[PDB]
Amino acid sequence: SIKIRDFGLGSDLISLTNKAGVTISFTNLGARIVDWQKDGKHLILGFDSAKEYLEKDAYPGATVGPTAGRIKDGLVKISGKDYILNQNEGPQTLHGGEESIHTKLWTYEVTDLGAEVQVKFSLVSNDGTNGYPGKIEMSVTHSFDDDNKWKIHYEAISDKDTVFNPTGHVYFNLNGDASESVENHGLRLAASRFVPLKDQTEIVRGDIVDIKNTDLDFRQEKQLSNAFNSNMEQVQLVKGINHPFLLDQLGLDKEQARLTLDDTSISVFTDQPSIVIFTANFGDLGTLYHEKKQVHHGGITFECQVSPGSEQIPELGDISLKAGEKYQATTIYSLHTKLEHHHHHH
Amino acid sequence: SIKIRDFGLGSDLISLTNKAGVTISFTNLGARIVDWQKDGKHLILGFDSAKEYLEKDAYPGATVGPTAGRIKDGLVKISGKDYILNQNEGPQTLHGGEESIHTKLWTYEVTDLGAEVQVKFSLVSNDGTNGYPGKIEMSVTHSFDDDNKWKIHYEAISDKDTVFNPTGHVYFNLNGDASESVENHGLRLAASRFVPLKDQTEIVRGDIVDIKNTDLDFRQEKQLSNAFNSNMEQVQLVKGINHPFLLDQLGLDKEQARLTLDDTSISVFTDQPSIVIFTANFGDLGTLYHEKKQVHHGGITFECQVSPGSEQIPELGDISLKAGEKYQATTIYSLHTKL
Ligand SMILES: OC[C@H]1O[C@H](O)[C@H](O)[C@@H](O)[C@H]1O
Ligand SMILES: OC[C@H]1O[C@H](O)[C@H](O)[C@@H](O)[C@H]1O
Ligand code: NA
Fold first, then answer.
1. Nearest CA of chain A to the CA of B316: how many Å?
2. The domain containing residue A53 runs over which residues?
3. Which residues make up the binding site for beta-D-galactose 1 (chain B) (predicted)?
């Protein structure tokens, strides 16, 4: 079933329930996921109204871009030309600049395919918006099926050579309470290397580091507490995790990551080369989620994209988008029950 | 009473009915007026869904900008520097460039004051959007009251020196049917001068012209057909009227124009110095409104703003907006019915 209602400020809330009774909801404000519940329990973080997003934190669950992550000094080279983008985090351009796509009302249309329902959000980034050459016609399709798979499909075309590397900013918290740390969740991630950050400004260091056998090694499932408790320089630098992880094997067919809590698991699939993992290292900020003060480490993202820093570390990839060329990216989050035995105590 | 409903593509339709039973409706798609009716008759042109506007014509009833009108070669000078805006009509920048603010979904909040109801639409134009320096935080408040006054109040703030001169693009048709020319309406307009167009590109010609005692003088009420049957080269040029008229006296208190058809009249008030009047000179286009095929002259606008062409005729004014300065504008469309 599909249901729609006003969500506030002119935004709408689109709620889907699949045949298994799992419900998930989105809003056109930032083509974003608002909630995902199983048996009355929230699997992710979200607010109850549009205003909350604009007043507390506009990122959760949003579609972010045109370029996700930090661009050192907002400087990009496009077809032999240097371009300076809006700098909204010191001299850095973070998640596309100020008042970016995650803050806009996107138009949308719903396609009911029976076992699958698709919500296609659309938006045009005008040429020059926040320094980005365009215009760029973008679309984000969020779909949910009877198999409990939530898929995000991005598409985009530009009138001019530009840069494009968006991502989905959902935060998971299998505890279903933001006031509960995710250190109790088990994490498995098919990545042998990571990208260290230079300092508190969080731009990339310039090197790629192997993490096998360190506290950041999750190739084999381990509790998140291991990382949180680590005194490795990078962990301390960011007070948790906030880094791009380079996937060892690419392809949408492979389970790149799996997050488990007791009988529930979320598997991550994507066609992107890295996963930026941010563990809500907010300290005592205590943003309220459903009247619960969120704790430090009260959530975890899996931002699949081309790793940030490619401006400095060419090896990470090329986020350039040629005029007329069609961009596409696909990321999938699938829900499972009793996928494995996870019986721990914190 | 207030009613909110889905207008399509995720856009909303906000309908306001006052004590008099008059109904006015708006959509966040382009902070625009969709309908205005009395006793079941539409006073303005509009569509029945969001899609239609996107597919047929996106300007009707919309808020247009940042700059309304045509800018020669898309060129403006800001703080002594030349800036090239998005060009969407040949080398001209028309109505702020392609995919402008009239095609975006604005956020909004409704405020019920009893005798009056306000609907405040907001949108942020990012710095650099379509070549315009910013960011510009814009808000357009459409309000409707028990006196049948529809008021538009504009406000904006920019982080950088820029240009700003928006307008409301409603088309009136007291016939209540697009298939019917407005030639039968009577118009009065407090303007003795106008701005002639250079040619078919519709950019300004360069001069200001006195219209006193011409087919374009409406200082004294007159029927539209007059203007429409005039052989003035300017009329002949655009096949109707598509020009900025320079108001004689400035100020919100003075009724600047009046459109009348029988018992029904619309008065226009503004704090702007000019009114651009366009008589839907669409030829055989035939755009469909409420299943009615539109006729040439099947509508008329009252675009209140600073006259287009100030880039070439500074006497017309200046549309710059310095960083940190607050822009404000107001335009009123008052409805009256004789007894
Ligand atoms: O709150 C948004 C969040 O987005 C990414 O994960 C960044 O790496 C974090 O530093 C933070 O900016
Ligand atoms: O269609 C929108 C309309 O906008 C103004 O009124 C112009 O003068 C007309 O030429 C036309 O372009
Ligand atoms: Na809506």
1. 29
2. 1-346
3. 70, 95, 202, 303
**CA-CA distance, A30 to A140, in Å (whole number)?**
10
Residue B10: its chain A contacts at CB < 8 A? Answer: 12, 28, 105-108
d(CA B282, CA B279): 9
- The three-class DSSP label of residue B193 is strand
Q: How far is Cα B66 from Cα B320, in angstroms, rounded to an integer?
A: 11
Contact B212, B204 (CB under 8 A): no
- The closest CB to that of A6, out of B4, B29, B126, belongs to B4
Number of C-beta neighbours around residue A339 at 10 A: 15
Strand, helix or coil for residue A234: helix
DSSP annotation of B102 reads: G
Resolution (A): 1.8
* Cα distance between residue A170 and residue A156, in whole Å: 21
What residues form DSSP beta bridges with B209? B194
The coordinates were experimentally obtained by X-ray
Closest approach of chain B CAs to the CA of A50, in angstroms?
Answer: 10
Q: For position A268, which CATH number holds?
A: 2.70.98.10
The beta strands (E) that lie in B21-69 are given as 23-27, 32-38, 41-42, 63-64
Q: Which residues pair with B82 in a beta bridge?
A: B77
Contact residues, chain A, for B128 at CB < 8 Å: 86, 128-132
Cβ distance of A126 and B99 shorter than 8 Å: yes
- Least Cα distance to A297 among A173, A197, A187 occurs for A173
The residues on B that touch A, with CB distances below 8 Å, are 4, 6, 9-12, 28-29, 50, 86, 97-100, 103-109, 124, 126-132, 135
Domain count, chain B: 1
Rounded CA gap, A154 and B224, in Å?
52
Cα distances (Å, whole numbers) of residue A206 to A203, A314, B231: 9, 10, 73
As a whole number of angstroms, the distance between CA B31 and CA B327 comes to 17
**From CA B222, how far away is CA B186, in angstroms rounded?**
5
- Inspect the interface and report whether the beta carbons of A10 and B6 lie closer than 8 Å: no
SS3 A15: strand
Contacts of B101 in chain A (CB under 8 A): none
Contact call for residues B281 and B156 (beta carbons, < 8 A): no
Q: Which of B118, B202, B132 is nearest to B165 (CA)?
A: B132
Which two three-digit tokens encode residue A28? 């056109």
Residue A66: is the preceding peptide bond cis (ω within 30°)? yes
